[PDB]
Design a protein around this ligand. Structure first.
Ligand code: DM2
Ligand code: CL
Ligand code: MN
Ligand code: MN
Ligand code: MN
Length: 10
DNA sequence: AGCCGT
DNA sequence: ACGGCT
């Protein structure tokens, strides 16, 4: 996720 | 640590 | 079949 906590996605 | 869609 | 950052 994020970043942080990419995306998702990307 | 933290999920999704080319 | 298989990748994206702080
Ligand atoms: C052992 O790999 C996996 C095993 C189980 C599920 C997964 C994957 C997986 O590798 C995977 C991905 O690599 C990707 C995604 C994904 O959901 C998974 C799994 O679910 C989603 C993503 O497609 C998008 O966000 C499109 O916008 C990008 C990424 O795709 C990669 C490869 C694609 N061919 C394309 O080049 C895309 C741009 O990046
Ligand atoms: Cl790439
Ligand atoms: Mn990990
Ligand atoms: Mn899927
Ligand atoms: Mn992977």
């Amino acid at each position: 996720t994020x970043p942080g906590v990419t995306x998702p996605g990307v």
